[PDB]
């Protein structure tokens, strides 16, 4: 039928912060993954539960496309079972994830000479996120045994920080755009097929 709007996800001018990650639902469409690999600006293109070279053979009930910016050296946290402040406090995949993780260096768009101000990550949380949970709160975080009463001060931390990407950062610190495609299989007819 008609073709899945991957362009709107991958070529969006602006991306979300990882703590406030974006989700777009993809349904009732043909998903030609040749587009994606053919546009070889990708430095991460990996899948779980499916083979990356065989995507064009497959059908799913729904596909979800989550997207955000992190540092290059945090892309490794975007995977089932990983630990670290990104996997635990910002964006968590389930252990049984079926889908693909794609990432590419976005230094030319997302870094700014004054320091990018909008890309944030959560660095403190009372407990880990559940898979696909999204937390946008900005409550002062009680790191000690003294209650904070909503006021920032010693051991009473603001819970987000900015990456501050600048064009001159080394490559592990440069911004990467990330798209996580979830391949959902429910007891239902399948609405996202490739050119099998």
């Amino acid at each position: 039928t008609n073709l899945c709007p991957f362009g709107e996800v991958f070529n969006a001018t602006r991306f979300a912060s990882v703590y406030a990650w974006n989700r777009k639902r993809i349904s009732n469409c043909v998903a030609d993954y040749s587009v994606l690999y053919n546009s070889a600006s990708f430095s991460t293109f990996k899948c779980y539960g499916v083979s990356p070279t065989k995507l064009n053979d497959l059908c799913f009930t729904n596909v979800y496309a989550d997207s955000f910016v992190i540092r290059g050296d945090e892309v490794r946290q975007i995977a089932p079972g990983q630990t670290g402040k990104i996997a635990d406090y910002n964006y968590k995949l389930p252990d049984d994830f079926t889908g693909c993780v794609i990432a590419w260096n976005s230094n030319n768009l997302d870094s700014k000479v004054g320091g990018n101000y909008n890309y944030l990550y959560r660095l403190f949380r009372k407990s880990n996120l559940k898979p696909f949970e999204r937390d946008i709160s900005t409550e002062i975080y009680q790191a000690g045994s003294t209650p904070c009463n909503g006021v920032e001060g010693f051991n009473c931390y603001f819970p987000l920080q900015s990456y501050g990407f600048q064009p001159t950062n080394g490559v592990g610190y440069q911004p990467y755009r990330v798209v996580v495609l979830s391949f959902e299989l429910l007891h239902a007819p399948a609405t996202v097929c490739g050119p099998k």
Partner: nanobody, 128 residues
């Protein structure tokens, strides 16, 4: 005694340059937004420049925008204030103190309401 000991400073002519720094004593800096403040002769301490915990966001008052650059090195627990194109009106004692983040992880100029541990500060004099 939690404190941020200021260093650097001194006497320069108009158009001169200074770099102040302030090092955390009794705590570590990493998660805290820090401001630089200055107390000109007979005046209140005014915020001049602030930087968020990560270093990613900075803010400057009008009279120093374009001339001062704040930065930090969390591994050394130090914050810096590079001051260029100095003017007589920049003459003041300069101090560091923790400030609050804004809810978008930026920084505001006011020291924590609690905070009483100003240092000695460091003297800056700009004169002909």
């Amino acid at each position: 005694q939690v404190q941020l000991v200021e260093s650097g400073g001194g006497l320069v002519q108009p158009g001169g340059t200074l770099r102040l720094s302030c090092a955390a004593s009794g705590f570590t800096l990493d998660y805290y937004a820090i401001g630089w403040f200055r107390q000109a002769p007979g005046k209140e301490r005014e915020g001049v420049s602030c930087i968020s915990g990560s270093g990613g966001i900075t803010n400057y008052t009008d009279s120093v925008k374009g001339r001062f650059t704040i930065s930090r090195d969390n591994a050394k627990n130090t914050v810096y204030l590079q001051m260029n194109s100095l003017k007589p009106e920049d003459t003041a004692v300069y101090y560091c103190a923790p400030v609050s983040h804004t809810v978008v992880a930026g920084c505001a100029f006011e020291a924590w309401t609690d905070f009483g541990s100003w240092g000695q500060g460091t003297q800056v004099t700009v004169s002909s």
